[PDB]
Amino acid sequence: SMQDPIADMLTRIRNGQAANKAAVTMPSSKLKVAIANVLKEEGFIEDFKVEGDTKPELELTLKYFQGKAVVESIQRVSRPGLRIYKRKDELPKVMAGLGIAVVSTSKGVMTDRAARQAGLGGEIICYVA
Amino acid sequence: KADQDKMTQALVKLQEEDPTFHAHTDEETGQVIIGGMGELHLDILVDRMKKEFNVECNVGAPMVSYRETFKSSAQVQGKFSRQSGGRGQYGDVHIEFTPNETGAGFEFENAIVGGVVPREYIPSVEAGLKDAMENGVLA
Amino acid sequence: ATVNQLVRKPRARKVAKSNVPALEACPQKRGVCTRVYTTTPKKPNSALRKVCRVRLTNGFEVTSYIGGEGHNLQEHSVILIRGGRVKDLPGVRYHTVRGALDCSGVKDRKQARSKYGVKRP
RNA sequence: AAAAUGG
RNA sequence: GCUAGUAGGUGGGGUAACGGCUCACCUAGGCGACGAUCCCUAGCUGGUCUGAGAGGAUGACCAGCCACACUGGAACUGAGACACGGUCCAGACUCCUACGGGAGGCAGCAGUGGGGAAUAUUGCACAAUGGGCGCAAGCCUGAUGCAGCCAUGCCGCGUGUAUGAAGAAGCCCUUCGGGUUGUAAAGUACUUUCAGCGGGGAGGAAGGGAGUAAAGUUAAUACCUUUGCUCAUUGACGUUACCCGCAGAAGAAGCACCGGCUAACUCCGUGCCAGCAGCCGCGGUAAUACGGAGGGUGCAAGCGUUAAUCGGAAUUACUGGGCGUAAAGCGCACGCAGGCGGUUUGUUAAGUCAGAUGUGAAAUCCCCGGGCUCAACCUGGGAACUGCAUCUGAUACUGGCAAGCUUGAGUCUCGUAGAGGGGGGUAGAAUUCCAGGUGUAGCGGUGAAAUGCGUAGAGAUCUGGAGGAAUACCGGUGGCGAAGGCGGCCCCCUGGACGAAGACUGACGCUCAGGUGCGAAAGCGUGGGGAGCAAACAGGAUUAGAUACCCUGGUAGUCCACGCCGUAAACGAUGUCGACUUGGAGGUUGUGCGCGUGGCUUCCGGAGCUAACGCGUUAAGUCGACCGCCUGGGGAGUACGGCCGCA
RNA sequence: GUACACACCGCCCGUCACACCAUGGGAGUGGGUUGCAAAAGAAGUAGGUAGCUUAACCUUCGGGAGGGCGCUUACCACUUUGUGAUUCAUGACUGGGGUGAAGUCGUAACAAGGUAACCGUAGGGGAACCUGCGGUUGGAUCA
Ligand SMILES: [K+]
Ligand SMILES: [K+]
Ligand SMILES: [K+]
Ligand SMILES: [K+]
Ligand SMILES: [K+]
Ligand SMILES: [K+]
Ligand SMILES: [K+]
Ligand SMILES: [K+]
Ligand SMILES: [K+]
Ligand SMILES: [K+]
Ligand SMILES: [K+]
Ligand SMILES: [K+]
Ligand SMILES: [K+]
Ligand SMILES: [K+]
Ligand SMILES: [K+]
Ligand SMILES: [K+]
Ligand SMILES: [Mg+2]
Ligand SMILES: [Mg+2]
Ligand SMILES: [Mg+2]
Ligand SMILES: [Mg+2]
Ligand SMILES: [Mg+2]
Ligand SMILES: [Mg+2]
Ligand SMILES: [Mg+2]
Ligand SMILES: [Mg+2]
Ligand SMILES: [Mg+2]
Ligand SMILES: [Mg+2]
Ligand SMILES: [Mg+2]
Ligand SMILES: [Mg+2]
Ligand SMILES: [Mg+2]
Ligand SMILES: [Mg+2]
Ligand SMILES: [Mg+2]
Ligand SMILES: [Mg+2]
Ligand SMILES: [Mg+2]
Ligand SMILES: [Mg+2]
Ligand SMILES: [Mg+2]
Ligand SMILES: [Mg+2]
Ligand SMILES: [Mg+2]
Ligand SMILES: [Mg+2]
Ligand SMILES: [Mg+2]
Ligand SMILES: [Mg+2]
Ligand SMILES: [Mg+2]
Ligand SMILES: [Mg+2]
Ligand SMILES: [Mg+2]
Ligand SMILES: [Mg+2]
Ligand SMILES: [Mg+2]
Ligand SMILES: [Mg+2]
Ligand SMILES: [Mg+2]
Ligand SMILES: [Mg+2]
Ligand SMILES: [Mg+2]
Ligand SMILES: [Mg+2]
Ligand SMILES: [Mg+2]
Ligand SMILES: [Mg+2]
Ligand SMILES: [Mg+2]
């Protein structure tokens, strides 16, 4: 059954980028929206929009540069089967800093860089290059 | 044979104890021959084995290596044919055996005429004879 | 394999056996020659390779190869054997150490003398 | 219809 | 599976102290698939080696801890021992004896024998550090400081340095022109580390012992104590380091390797011989692969070999691998434990995260330095010790608790299709047999025959009857079922699936070791049945033979009931569940209004994936959850043991 | 189509004969370790006390208290017996496996391999195998 919704979101993006889809819609959640904000601020997606009330849906507008998807690789790190937590000094660097790592800290979801500045470790949600 | 290994060790020690003691296994007979400067000498050694070395042994006369030789001359034929299908095995040789000069051993003569036996097969014939000669033809 | 399966049953290594069991983790072992003889190599080689059955101090009886040209080894000769199998000889997994114990060095050897226990000419 | 083999 | 002081309680006793520690009594507990019990192996650690790391391997020396001291056992004394150089008892050994009885314990140091591939001198000194005793002096110390042996390792240095064409001889090779050794050597000019000889010379030495002085103390300028002061005095190493002087290149290079891997090639000898070899292989008369020589390559007081560990090996893959066909998806399903789990709010702060505090011996490793002429080596400080406990915080995510929601899951209302299952009944065709009629010489069979059958009337044809088994056509890349499977028609009982439109419940889910159920054919048990077919068997052919293939016969079995077996290329050689990602042409079955919209299914194909073949929205694409399984070919899915079975 | 590549005069299977090696079974035989049920009881320590004996204290001067010795009980080492378990060694003979060498007998598979092959099961046969039943395609053919 459906057990990892975050990995599904990442798959939808990846599969959408590979299929050259303008936007990818999915069932919405607070954590999904948080990650969507981090992706948008880091310039991996164009925009996101949550619509509906009883059953909200999150639509993400994907961005393609020179006919190539901006998100070259998006992979889930921490998963239900194996959760990954890192201290502030152990925070991962994706693509030697050229990529981002979405991390859930005690002060909310943020990039690895931001978390390292705040001196906060947390759960490594995904790597986005 | 448990004491045989001990006997080896015993003979080694005995040789160290007495220079005149000489232990040597005759290869042909396959029997170990003990050499001494006297009967009493050897007797004492054997008694020592029985006690000191705790190796039970019984002395005997060394076996003699004999040989054989044809006392008569006769021309003979050796034919081997085994063909029942596909590659077979044919071979026929007419060899004359004659008593050689005592001590001259083997004096094979290739008197093949008309190249009936090809040159390549000739050495094999001789070699085969030699091996068979090494094996007993009488006893 | 999944992590959960690995927690239940961890990754398993291998025993890895020795090619020279009679040595019993020793550089060399002393032994007495029980039979010195010759044997034919397996195809595609042809020769009369010199070998000797040896009863080691540890109590194992093994076959050892007598390297070099010419040897003075007879039955009841104390020799030192080392590790080293012979490809074309089936069952010979040890080599006699030339120039040690009752084993003599190869004569008329001017190259690789240390490997045949020959003193500097 | 039968129709093996070939260090 | 394990356990009767066993698990606990109560009281008594016992210990320095808690305690089944012990005893009595009472209760019936305790432990274990988070591995008990039992078996095998083993001193543990800081560390060491290898590795980019994660790991793997290891625990010699040094330091901490534990255990043991001829073997088995016991206590005594003492602050401390159930006591290496104490006691008692027993045992095995060795020794003494007057035969009655005695004595002893190198796993302290050295040393001996034995074992082994292999591991050192029966040295010196308590000069120093530390320890026991003593007021102190001092005494004791195989601790310790040092010396001996050993290339065992590590580190530093040397064995000369410039010049030198004569491109000498001499060697090897050569196309006989020459080339190479090779500036290499001679020859010439220098230097002398080190070794050797000679002569100087630290430092490790602190203190202690004499006095002498002041102060303190005291009745006392006593004695004692303290701190100064003064005078002789203490080095095993030791012929110390080091320095200096003298003679003279003198006194000082070897080991392995040159077919590829792998840096280094020719000649000669030998001729599948002798031999070589890590692997691939090499040697049978033009061997860069054997052996020798010349020449070279690499290392160097070492160089090889062997053993051994890690690496390379992503070849157990945590980091970091696979399972359509290479090894690998359980035959299928249900399901407990376990793992994992939609969405929203609040709450808690377990995980997690942050900071702090304590601890994580020293050494080692690492960094920055200092000291030995340098280095090895020694040393100061720092770092690190990634861990653990505690306190104070953060609260997103994960977890717990509480209330929710509907989207997953489920229920109900209605209809549809189906060889889904179980039971009972029935129909038509055909085969066989039995009885009778007609009729007459063949029939049957094969590649060709023959066996066989037939004048005791076959075969053929017609009529009546008996019995068993299977259901032509429909019929289909059709349908139904978890899989195995399921096919005339009818009734009875019963399971699932799908569609339409609503309502209801509210995460009620997914996977699943062990467990349990189902599971073709053959086979097995008992009782029935037996048409046709047919293992076995028989005869006839075929053939060199023919234990076959072919022919004529034919039993078990095939069928039914009940029970057992539990396996198949049980296959899509593709585990299950969920989400996502271009198309086309069909089949089958609902449903809405020619165009839609569901279920299932067949072919083809795009991206992507794949070793390739191929797969391709029914994935072998892209991801997540859980399970099963693989780790070269044989040996072998075999042996042994266990469990199951009537076999 | 193919399991062939000095290329079908290819490749290749099993029994049998001989030699060698490892290993299973085997009347048993000899060791190690160990479970259970008992027996045993040195020394020591603790408890009791037939008897014997006694520096320190008390005393009515007699003795008393207390102690020691001996004895006795409990615990217990050596040792002993019976019966199991496990492990190792060895054993007449025997099963299968592997490696030999131009042996013997066939030709089962690879082409439609000359009866397509293979899987499970059953029966038969010197051997490879053959035959029945059901299953699979990992079979060729189609003019
Ligand atoms: K060869
Ligand atoms: K207890
Ligand atoms: K108690
Ligand atoms: K370790
Ligand atoms: K002990
Ligand atoms: K004391
Ligand atoms: K001292
Ligand atoms: K992995
Ligand atoms: K469950
Ligand atoms: K929370
Ligand atoms: K029948
Ligand atoms: K499973
Ligand atoms: K056997
Ligand atoms: K036995
Ligand atoms: K066949
Ligand atoms: K069959
Ligand atoms: Mg041990
Ligand atoms: Mg590695
Ligand atoms: Mg005491
Ligand atoms: Mg003592
Ligand atoms: Mg001692
Ligand atoms: Mg000693
Ligand atoms: Mg020795
Ligand atoms: Mg003394
Ligand atoms: Mg090279
Ligand atoms: Mg030559
Ligand atoms: Mg190695
Ligand atoms: Mg590895
Ligand atoms: Mg692999
Ligand atoms: Mg296969
Ligand atoms: Mg396979
Ligand atoms: Mg399956
Ligand atoms: Mg299931
Ligand atoms: Mg917490
Ligand atoms: Mg430390
Ligand atoms: Mg929560
Ligand atoms: Mg129905
Ligand atoms: Mg179906
Ligand atoms: Mg059946
Ligand atoms: Mg039956
Ligand atoms: Mg029939
Ligand atoms: Mg038939
Ligand atoms: Mg199976
Ligand atoms: Mg099937
Ligand atoms: Mg399978
Ligand atoms: Mg396709
Ligand atoms: Mg089996
Ligand atoms: Mg046996
Ligand atoms: Mg007693
Ligand atoms: Mg055939
Ligand atoms: Mg065939
Ligand atoms: Mg076939
Ligand atoms: Mg048959």
From Swiss-Prot, chain A:
Swiss-Prot/TrEMBL keywords: Repressor, Ribonucleoprotein, Ribosomal protein, RNA-binding, rRNA-binding, Translation regulation
GO molecular function, one term: structural constituent of ribosome
Biological-process GO terms, alphabetical: cytoplasmic translation; regulation of mRNA stability; regulation of translation; ribosomal small subunit assembly
Top-level taxon of the source organism: Bacteria
Subunit organization: Part of the 30S ribosomal subunit. Contacts proteins S5 and S12.
Cellular component aspect of the GO annotation: cytoplasm; cytosol; cytosolic small ribosomal subunit
Taxonomic lineage from the root: Bacteria, Pseudomonadati, Pseudomonadota, Gammaproteobacteria, Enterobacterales
Protein name in UniProt: Small ribosomal subunit protein uS8
Pfam family, one: Ribosomal_S8
Family: Belongs to the universal ribosomal protein uS8 family.
Family annotation (PANTHER family): 40S RIBOSOMAL PROTEIN S15A
PROSITE patterns: RIBOSOMAL_S8
Described purpose of this protein according to its UniProt entry: One of the primary rRNA binding proteins, it binds directly to 16S rRNA central domain where it helps coordinate assembly of the platform of the 30S subunit.
NCBIfam families assigned to the protein according to its UniProt record, in alphabetical order: PRK00136.1
Swiss-Prot record, chain B:
Primary localization: cytoplasm
Protein's cellular compartments: Cytoplasm
Record organism: Staphylococcus aureus (strain NCTC 8325 / PS 47)
Protein function: Catalyzes the GTP-dependent ribosomal translocation step during translation elongation. During this step, the ribosome changes from the pre-translocational (PRE) to the post-translocational (POST) state as the newly formed A-site-bound peptidyl-tRNA and P-site-bound deacylated tRNA move to the P and E sites, respectively. Catalyzes the coordinated movement of the two tRNA molecules, the mRNA and conformational changes in the ribosome.
Gene Ontology MF: a single term: GTPase activity
The protein's name: Elongation factor G
Any GO BP annotation: ribosome disassembly
Lineage: Bacteria, Bacillati, Bacillota, Bacilli, Bacillales
Membrane-spanning parts: none
Name of the gene this protein is made from: fusA
Family listed: Belongs to the TRAFAC class translation factor GTPase superfamily. Classic translation factor GTPase family. EF-G/EF-2 subfamily.
Domain of life of the native organism: Bacteria
CC per GO annotation: cytoplasm
Keywords: Cytoplasm, Elongation factor, GTP-binding, Nucleotide-binding, Protein biosynthesis
UniProtKB/Swiss-Prot annotation, chain C:
Keywords: Acetylation, Antibiotic resistance, Methylation, Ribonucleoprotein, Ribosomal protein, RNA-binding, rRNA-binding, tRNA-binding
Residues with PTM N6-acetyllysine: K107
Gene Ontology MF, one: rRNA binding
Post-translational modification 3-methylthioaspartic acid, affected residues: D88
Consequence of substituting L56H: Protein is not incorporated into ribosomes
Outcome, altering K42R: Confers streptomycin resistance but not hyperaccurate translation
InterPro entries reported in the protein's UniProt record: NA-bd_OB-fold, Ribosomal_uS12, Ribosomal_uS12_bac
Record GO cellular component, one term: cytosolic small ribosomal subunit
BP terms from Gene Ontology: cytoplasmic translation; Group I intron splicing; maintenance of translational fidelity; positive regulation of RNA splicing; response to antibiotic; RNA folding; translation
PROSITE patterns: RIBOSOMAL_S12
Note: At least 19 substitutions or deletions in 11 codons can promote streptomycin resistance, dependence or pseudodependence; all but one of the streptomycin resistant mutations (K42R) are associated with hyperaccurate translation and thus reduced translational efficiency. The streptomycin sensitive allele is dominant to resistant alleles.
PANTHER family per UniProt: 30S RIBOSOMAL PROTEIN S12 FAMILY MEMBER
Family per record: Belongs to the universal ribosomal protein uS12 family.
Quaternary context: Part of the 30S ribosomal subunit. Contacts proteins S8 and S17. Interacts with ArfA. May interact with IF1 in the 30S initiation complex.
Record's function text: With S4 and S5 plays an important role in translational accuracy.
Protein name listed in UniProt: Small ribosomal subunit protein uS12
Gene: rpsL
